[PDB]
Coordinates of all heavy atoms in Angstrom, one line a residue:
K1 N -107.6 74.1 -79.9 CA -108.0 74.2 -78.5 C -107.6 75.5 -77.8 O -108.4 76.1 -77.1 CB -107.5 73.0 -77.7 CG -108.3 71.7 -77.8 CD -107.9 70.8 -76.6 CE -108.9 69.7 -76.5 NZ -108.6 68.9 -75.3
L2 N -106.4 75.9 -78.1 CA -105.9 77.1 -77.5 C -106.7 78.4 -77.9 O -107.1 79.2 -77.1 CB -104.4 77.3 -77.8 CG -103.6 78.5 -77.2 CD1 -103.7 78.6 -75.7 CD2 -102.2 78.5 -77.7
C3 N -107.0 78.4 -79.2 CA -107.8 79.5 -79.8 C -109.2 79.6 -79.2 O -109.7 80.6 -78.9 CB -107.8 79.5 -81.3 SG -106.2 79.9 -82.0
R4 N -109.8 78.4 -79.1 CA -111.1 78.3 -78.4 C -111.1 78.8 -77.0 O -112.0 79.5 -76.6 CB -111.6 76.8 -78.5 CG -113.1 76.6 -78.2 CD -113.5 75.1 -78.3 NE -113.4 74.6 -79.7 CZ -112.5 73.7 -80.1 NH1 -111.7 73.1 -79.3 NH2 -112.6 73.3 -81.4
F5 N -110.0 78.4 -76.3 CA -109.8 78.8 -74.9 C -109.7 80.3 -74.7 O -110.4 80.9 -73.9 CB -108.6 78.0 -74.3 CG -108.3 78.4 -72.9 CD1 -109.0 77.8 -71.8 CD2 -107.3 79.4 -72.6 CE1 -108.7 78.2 -70.5 CE2 -107.0 79.7 -71.2 CZ -107.7 79.1 -70.2
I6 N -108.9 80.9 -75.6 CA -108.6 82.3 -75.6 C -109.9 83.1 -75.8 O -110.1 84.1 -75.1 CB -107.5 82.7 -76.6 CG1 -106.1 82.2 -76.2 CG2 -107.5 84.2 -76.9 CD1 -105.1 82.1 -77.3
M7 N -110.7 82.7 -76.8 CA -111.9 83.4 -77.1 C -112.9 83.3 -76.0 O -113.6 84.3 -75.7 CB -112.5 83.0 -78.5 CG -111.5 83.2 -79.6 SD -110.8 84.9 -79.7 CE -112.2 85.8 -80.2
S8 N -113.0 82.2 -75.3 CA -113.9 82.0 -74.1 C -113.4 82.9 -73.0 O -114.2 83.5 -72.3 CB -114.0 80.6 -73.7 OG -114.8 79.9 -74.6
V9 N -112.1 83.0 -72.7 CA -111.5 83.8 -71.7 C -111.9 85.3 -72.0 O -112.4 86.0 -71.1 CB -110.0 83.7 -71.6 CG1 -109.4 84.7 -70.7 CG2 -109.7 82.3 -71.1
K10 N -111.7 85.7 -73.3 CA -112.1 87.1 -73.7 C -113.5 87.4 -73.4 O -113.8 88.5 -72.9 CB -111.8 87.2 -75.2 CG -112.3 88.5 -75.9 CD -112.3 88.3 -77.4 CE -112.9 89.6 -78.0 NZ -112.0 90.7 -78.0
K11 N -114.4 86.5 -73.8 CA -115.9 86.6 -73.6 C -116.2 86.8 -72.1 O -117.3 87.4 -71.8 CB -116.6 85.4 -74.2 CG -118.1 85.3 -73.9 CD -118.7 84.2 -74.8 CE -119.8 83.5 -74.0 NZ -120.9 84.4 -73.5
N12 N -115.4 86.3 -71.2 CA -115.6 86.4 -69.7 C -115.0 87.5 -69.0 O -115.0 87.7 -67.8 CB -115.3 85.0 -69.1 CG -116.4 84.0 -69.4 OD1 -117.5 84.0 -68.9 ND2 -116.1 83.1 -70.3
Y13 N -114.3 88.4 -69.8 CA -113.8 89.7 -69.3 C -114.9 90.7 -69.6 O -115.6 90.7 -70.7 CB -112.5 90.1 -69.9 CG -111.3 89.6 -69.1 CD1 -110.7 88.3 -69.4 CD2 -110.8 90.3 -68.0 CE1 -109.7 87.8 -68.7 CE2 -109.7 89.8 -67.3 CZ -109.1 88.6 -67.7 OH -108.0 88.1 -67.0
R14 N -115.1 91.7 -68.7 CA -116.2 92.7 -68.9 C -115.7 94.0 -69.5 O -114.5 94.3 -69.5 CB -116.8 93.0 -67.5 CG -117.4 91.8 -66.8 CD -118.1 92.2 -65.5 NE -118.6 91.0 -64.8 CZ -119.9 90.8 -64.6 NH1 -120.8 91.7 -64.9 NH2 -120.3 89.7 -63.9
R15 N -116.7 94.8 -70.0 CA -116.4 96.1 -70.6 C -116.2 97.2 -69.5 O -117.1 98.0 -69.3 CB -117.4 96.5 -71.6 CG -117.6 95.6 -72.8 CD -118.6 96.2 -73.8 NE -119.5 95.2 -74.4 CZ -120.6 94.9 -73.9 NH1 -121.0 95.4 -72.7 NH2 -121.4 94.0 -74.5
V16 N -115.2 97.1 -68.7 CA -114.8 98.0 -67.7 C -113.6 98.9 -68.1 O -112.9 98.5 -69.0 CB -114.6 97.3 -66.3 CG1 -115.9 96.8 -65.7 CG2 -113.5 96.3 -66.4
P17 N -113.4 100.0 -67.4 CA -112.3 100.9 -67.9 C -111.0 100.2 -67.9 O -110.3 100.2 -68.9 CB -112.4 102.1 -66.9 CG -113.9 102.1 -66.5 CD -114.2 100.7 -66.4
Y18 N -110.6 99.7 -66.8 CA -109.2 99.0 -66.6 C -109.1 97.5 -66.5 O -108.2 97.0 -67.1 CB -108.6 99.7 -65.5 CG -107.2 99.2 -65.2 CD1 -106.1 99.5 -66.0 CD2 -106.9 98.4 -64.0 CE1 -104.8 99.0 -65.8 CE2 -105.6 97.9 -63.8 CZ -104.6 98.2 -64.6 OH -103.3 97.7 -64.4
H19 N -109.9 96.9 -65.7 CA -109.8 95.4 -65.5 C -110.4 94.6 -66.6 O -111.3 93.8 -66.3 CB -110.3 95.0 -64.1 CG -109.4 95.4 -63.0 ND1 -109.6 96.6 -62.2 CD2 -108.3 94.8 -62.4 CE1 -108.6 96.7 -61.3 NE2 -107.8 95.6 -61.4
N20 N -110.0 94.9 -67.8 CA -110.6 94.3 -69.0 C -109.7 93.4 -69.7 O -108.6 93.0 -69.2 CB -111.1 95.5 -69.9 CG -110.0 96.5 -70.2 OD1 -108.8 96.1 -70.4 ND2 -110.3 97.8 -70.1
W21 N -110.1 92.9 -70.9 CA -109.4 92.0 -71.8 C -108.0 92.5 -72.2 O -107.0 91.8 -72.2 CB -110.2 91.7 -73.0 CG -109.6 90.8 -74.1 CD1 -109.5 91.0 -75.4 CD2 -109.0 89.5 -73.8 NE1 -108.9 89.9 -76.0 CE2 -108.6 88.9 -75.1 CE3 -108.8 88.7 -72.7 CZ2 -108.0 87.7 -75.3 CZ3 -108.2 87.4 -72.8 CH2 -107.8 87.0 -74.1
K22 N -107.9 93.9 -72.4 CA -106.6 94.5 -72.7 C -105.6 94.3 -71.5 O -104.4 94.0 -71.8 CB -106.7 96.0 -73.0 CG -105.5 96.6 -73.6 CD -105.7 98.0 -74.1 CE -104.6 98.5 -75.0 NZ -104.8 99.8 -75.6
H23 N -106.0 94.5 -70.3 CA -105.2 94.3 -69.1 C -104.7 92.9 -69.0 O -103.5 92.7 -68.6 CB -106.0 94.7 -67.9 CG -105.3 94.4 -66.6 ND1 -104.2 95.1 -66.2 CD2 -105.6 93.6 -65.5 CE1 -103.8 94.6 -65.0 NE2 -104.7 93.7 -64.6
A24 N -105.5 91.9 -69.3 CA -105.2 90.5 -69.2 C -104.0 90.2 -70.1 O -103.0 89.6 -69.7 CB -106.4 89.6 -69.5
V25 N -104.1 90.6 -71.4 CA -103.0 90.4 -72.4 C -101.8 91.2 -72.1 O -100.7 90.7 -72.3 CB -103.5 90.7 -73.8 CG1 -102.5 90.3 -74.9 CG2 -104.8 89.9 -74.1
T26 N -101.9 92.4 -71.5 CA -100.8 93.2 -71.1 C -100.0 92.6 -70.0 O -98.8 92.6 -70.0 CB -101.2 94.6 -70.7 OG1 -101.8 95.3 -71.9 CG2 -100.1 95.5 -70.3
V27 N -100.7 92.0 -69.0 CA -100.1 91.3 -67.8 C -99.4 90.1 -68.3 O -98.2 89.8 -67.9 CB -101.1 91.0 -66.7 CG1 -100.5 90.1 -65.7 CG2 -101.5 92.3 -66.1
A28 N -100.0 89.4 -69.3 CA -99.4 88.2 -69.9 C -98.1 88.5 -70.7 O -97.2 87.7 -70.6 CB -100.4 87.5 -70.8
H29 N -98.1 89.7 -71.3 CA -96.9 90.1 -72.0 C -95.7 90.4 -71.1 O -94.6 90.0 -71.4 CB -97.1 91.3 -72.9 CG -95.8 91.9 -73.3 ND1 -95.2 92.9 -72.6 CD2 -94.9 91.6 -74.4 CE1 -94.0 93.3 -73.2 NE2 -93.9 92.5 -74.3
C30 N -96.0 91.0 -70.0 CA -94.9 91.3 -69.0 C -94.3 90.0 -68.5 O -93.1 89.9 -68.3 CB -95.5 92.1 -67.8 SG -94.1 92.8 -66.8
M31 N -95.2 89.0 -68.2 CA -94.7 87.6 -67.8 C -93.9 87.0 -68.9 O -92.8 86.4 -68.6 CB -95.9 86.7 -67.5 CG -95.6 85.3 -67.0 SD -94.5 85.3 -65.5 CE -95.6 85.8 -64.2
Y32 N -94.3 87.2 -70.2 CA -93.5 86.7 -71.3 C -92.1 87.2 -71.3 O -91.1 86.4 -71.4 CB -94.2 87.0 -72.6 CG -93.4 86.8 -73.9 CD1 -93.2 85.6 -74.4 CD2 -92.8 87.9 -74.5 CE1 -92.5 85.4 -75.6 CE2 -92.0 87.7 -75.6 CZ -91.9 86.5 -76.2 OH -91.1 86.3 -77.3
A33 N -92.0 88.5 -71.1 CA -90.7 89.2 -71.1 C -89.8 88.7 -69.9 O -88.6 88.6 -70.1 CB -90.9 90.7 -71.1
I34 N -90.4 88.5 -68.8 CA -89.7 88.0 -67.6 C -89.2 86.6 -67.9 O -88.0 86.3 -67.6 CB -90.6 88.0 -66.3 CG1 -90.8 89.5 -65.9 CG2 -89.9 87.3 -65.2 CD1 -91.8 89.7 -64.7
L35 N -90.1 85.7 -68.4 CA -89.7 84.3 -68.8 C -88.6 84.3 -69.8 O -87.7 83.5 -69.6 CB -91.0 83.6 -69.3 CG -91.8 82.7 -68.4 CD1 -91.7 83.0 -66.9 CD2 -93.2 82.6 -68.9
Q36 N -88.7 85.1 -70.8 CA -87.7 85.1 -71.9 C -86.3 85.6 -71.5 O -85.3 85.1 -72.0 CB -88.2 85.9 -73.1 CG -89.4 85.3 -73.9 CD -89.1 83.9 -74.4 OE1 -88.6 83.8 -75.6 NE2 -89.3 82.9 -73.6
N37 N -86.3 86.5 -70.5 CA -85.1 87.0 -70.0 C -84.5 86.2 -68.8 O -83.4 86.5 -68.3 CB -85.2 88.5 -69.6 CG -85.3 89.3 -70.9 OD1 -84.2 89.6 -71.5 ND2 -86.5 89.7 -71.3
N38 N -85.3 85.2 -68.3 CA -84.9 84.3 -67.3 C -85.2 82.9 -67.7 O -85.7 82.1 -67.0 CB -85.6 84.6 -66.0 CG -85.3 86.0 -65.4 OD1 -84.3 86.2 -64.7 ND2 -86.1 87.0 -65.8
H39 N -84.7 82.5 -68.9 CA -85.2 81.4 -69.7 C -84.7 80.0 -69.1 O -85.4 79.0 -69.3 CB -84.9 81.5 -71.2 CG -85.8 80.6 -72.1 ND1 -85.3 79.6 -72.7 CD2 -87.1 80.7 -72.4 CE1 -86.3 79.0 -73.4 NE2 -87.4 79.7 -73.2
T40 N -83.6 80.0 -68.4 CA -83.1 78.8 -67.9 C -83.7 78.4 -66.6 O -83.4 77.3 -66.1 CB -81.5 78.8 -67.7 OG1 -81.2 79.8 -66.7 CG2 -80.8 79.2 -69.1
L41 N -84.5 79.2 -66.0 CA -85.0 79.0 -64.6 C -86.2 78.2 -64.5 O -86.4 77.5 -63.5 CB -85.2 80.4 -63.9 CG -84.0 81.4 -63.8 CD1 -84.4 82.4 -62.7 CD2 -82.7 80.7 -63.6
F42 N -87.1 78.3 -65.4 CA -88.5 77.7 -65.3 C -88.7 76.4 -66.1 O -88.1 76.2 -67.2 CB -89.5 78.8 -65.7 CG -89.4 80.1 -65.0 CD1 -88.6 81.1 -65.5 CD2 -90.0 80.2 -63.7 CE1 -88.5 82.3 -64.8 CE2 -89.8 81.4 -63.0 CZ -89.1 82.5 -63.6

């Protein structure tokens, strides 16, 4: 289900210079690092 969801999300990002699929995953990574370094909080 997760893989299906991810591919559909990908399909709904456009081929623009910056606000694209790469930006989405990059923002998600920054959140990952915040979560991992503040792991007892959430």
Side-chain angles (χ1 to χ4, degrees):
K1 276 200 167 185
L2 182 56
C3 288
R4 197 180 290 114
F5 179 82
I6 288 158
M7 297 314 287
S8 285
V9 172
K10 174 197 175 71
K11 174 170 143 56
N12 288 282
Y13 274 91
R14 302 181 180 245
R15 299 187 221 87
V16 290
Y18 179 71
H19 287 97
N20 51 44
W21 182 228
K22 192 171 191 178
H23 173 66
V25 184
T26 298
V27 170
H29 166 269
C30 194
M31 182 58 72
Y32 167 79
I34 294 172
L35 261 26
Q36 290 303 267
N37 287 282
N38 299 271
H39 202 250
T40 65
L41 305 197
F42 306 95

